[PDB]
From a paper:
We previously identified a circular bacteriocin [name] from Lactiplantibacillus plantarum B21 (previously known as [name]). This family II circular bacteriocin has antimicrobial activity against foodborne pathogens including Listeria monocytogenes and Clostridium perfringens and other closely related Lactobacillus species. Of these, circular bacteriocins (class I) have gained attention due to their unique characteristics of high thermal and pH stability, as well as resistance to degradation by many proteolytic enzymes. The covalently linked N- and C-termini form a structurally distinct cyclic peptide backbone.
In the present study, we report the crystal structure of [name]. A crystal from these conditions diffracted to 1.8 Å resolution and belonged to the space group C2221. The crystal structure diffraction data were phased by molecular replacement using a theoretical α-helix (8 residues long polyalanine) as a search model. There are two independent molecules of [name] in the asymmetric unit. The structures of these two molecules (Chain A and Chain B) are similar to each other, with a Cα backbone root-mean-square deviation, RMSD of 0.56 Å across 58 Cα atoms. The four α-helices in the crystal structure are connected by loops of 1 to 6 residues and enclose a hydrophobic core in a tightly folded globular arrangement. Helix α1 and helix α4 are linked covalently between Ile1 and Ala58 in the middle of helix α4, creating a circular backbone. The second, third and fourth α-helices are predominantly hydrophobic, with the linked amino acids at the N- and C-termini in helix α4 buried in the core of the structure. In contrast, helix α1 is amphipathic, with hydrophilic residues (Thr14, Gln18, Ser25 and Ser26) exposed at the surface of the protein. The protein has an overall net charge of + 3 at physiological pH, with four cationic residues located in helix α1 (Lys15 and Lys19), helix α4 (Arg6) and the loop connecting α1/α4 (His11), and one anionic residue located in helix α1 (Asp22).
Numbering used by the authors: 1 to 58
Amino acid sequence: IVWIARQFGVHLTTKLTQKALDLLSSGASLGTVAAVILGVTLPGWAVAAAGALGGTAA
């Protein structure tokens, strides 16, 4: 989540992180979480690059 926020210009709050992590952990895809929570439509290469990290780092 941190890498996404950094690379795509999102102001990341602790609340946005908390929501994203729970949703990812429950089974929503990294792309959908990025779009819905972080407001960022990720290209394919960015979904892959972020997905290589642990969830908080992603």
